[PDB]
Design a protein around this ligand. Sequence first.
Ligand code: ZN
Ligand code: ZN
Length: 226
Amino acid sequence: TGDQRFGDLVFRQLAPNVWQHTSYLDMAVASNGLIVRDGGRVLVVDTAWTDDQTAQILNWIKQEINLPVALAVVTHAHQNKMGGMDALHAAGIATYANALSNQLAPQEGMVAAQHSLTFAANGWVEPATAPNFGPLKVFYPGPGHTSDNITVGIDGTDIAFGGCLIKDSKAKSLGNLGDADTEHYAASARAFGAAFPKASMIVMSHSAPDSRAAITHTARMADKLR
Ligand SMILES: [Zn+2]
Ligand SMILES: [Zn+2]
């Protein structure tokens, strides 16, 4: 209830101007991103697993929102986040990613975003690299899930997007591979929480939106790794 199926994708409205988009890849693994309505334009966080799935995202937006997609930001260089970059570019959408994500993308078989984000030493995005991001507040919490993994808060809402960094409050593991920073993971998770201290709805890549318990639980799980 509240979920719209659209082809093989699923869309859930989280707020008047925010939807979660979900795509699947058989390895039947879900991956979430965000769609944000900002006045006369749409902003997208993360692609779907594939170009064709991402094109469907844009199809859904055209139908349900009917506003031009101005830009997209992807939160790290893995297929579930950057797999549909070509689809974004073919639609004339300006794309942004961590400079490191763009550096890693060719090795991961991903297409690099058109623009590179860089970050101050306190983790907040450098304003000039993220021009006209509207309500999107982009924060690099430090290495965790990956070295390049970044997070996005939505001003005007209680929503913060933790991507693959944050696991749900009942997650039985962190499901990291070799590119995880198991030393700094805990601190990065907590940095994310501190960057968006008022966010009460935490959106993440691999499960439904959860409370702030997702953040503290993730950090506590990561504490066991150090
Ligand atoms: Zn990942
Ligand atoms: Zn993931």
